[PDB]
Amino acid sequence: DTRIGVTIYKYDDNFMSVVRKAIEQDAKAAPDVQLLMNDSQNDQSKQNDQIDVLLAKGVKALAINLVDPAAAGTVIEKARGQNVPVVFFNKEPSRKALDSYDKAYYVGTDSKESGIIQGDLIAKHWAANQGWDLNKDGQIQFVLLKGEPGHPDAEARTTYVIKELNDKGIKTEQLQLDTAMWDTAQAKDKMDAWLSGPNANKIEVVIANNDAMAMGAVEALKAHNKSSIPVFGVDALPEALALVKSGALAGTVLNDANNQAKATFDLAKNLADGKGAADGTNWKIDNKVVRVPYVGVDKDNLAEF
Ligand SMILES: OC[C@H]1O[C@@H](O)[C@H](O)[C@@H](O)[C@@H]1O
Ligand SMILES: [Ca+2]
């Protein structure tokens, strides 16, 4: 049986929970694969030790969701010594890191695209819901819940949601902006703070860089009897889709966990087998990278997900 080792940066990250469960199902369909999957508990030192163990166990490929993207070289050097291929996923290593090893690959997304799509989606719903412009000024007064500072998906979603609105002629006014570190509880706390501060009843739209944080904002709005304020996320988590259907979330953007898991598995299995990474598949690998598209989601198209 071919052993494939997988490290997940943090099991209880909502999005990576969807990804890891999907990878488990791809591996279950491969009768000759034993999956060795680890929770790194948000600590790169723990992950490094897990990789040593996976290599001791003779895995034929590694699929690595880094805690710290800067540790890509550390991981590569472990793998190099055993000639083991590494498919990094979701936390993007640098170009130089990928180019340092002939058997390093990456599966992820075009981070900018999700921000653009989210801004276009907000624009559509803004146009359709003129009552959302509480102060009648033609501008969106917003608050924004950011992911981890320096994470490329947080930075791009934060920049491009606003750029896209502004580029379409929709002026925006940032009433509050802070990180909630991708986390529901932190986002509920932060949103509750904003609902307790001087801008509370000026807020017209809540923009979150992911669904977990959007969900925390939804909870805080409910507690304040302000559920009429729309909230937008990114990921299209199953739980978030249920909230789109119920009207509690105004819209989101699919971060396609199923295809990211499938590509990661397929590439890792091919490489474990000594084949070309994309053999037998339709994955498009561009200079060692696969990027899976995002798709905007709201009630009108929900049943396609
Ligand atoms: O790296 C982890 C992060 O990846 C992003 O692409 C997701 O949208 C976030 O929900 C997740 O927290
Ligand atoms: Ca306004």
UniProtKB/Swiss-Prot annotation:
For this UniProt entry, what is the primary localization, expressed as one broad class? periplasm
Sequence positions that bind beta-D-galactose: D13, N90, H151, D153, R157, N210, D235, N255
Record InterPro entries: Bact_Solute-Bind_Prot2, MglB-like_PBP1, Peripla_BP_I, SBP_2_dom
- Short name of any one Pfam family annotated for the protein: Peripla_BP_4
User: Keywords on this record?
Assistant: Calcium, Chemotaxis, Metal-binding, Periplasm, Signal, Sugar transport, Transport
Which GO molecular function annotations are given, in alphabetical order?
calcium ion binding; carbohydrate binding
Q: From the Swiss-Prot or TrEMBL record, give the protein name.
A: D-galactose/methyl-galactoside binding periplasmic protein MglB
Name the gene that codes for it: mglB
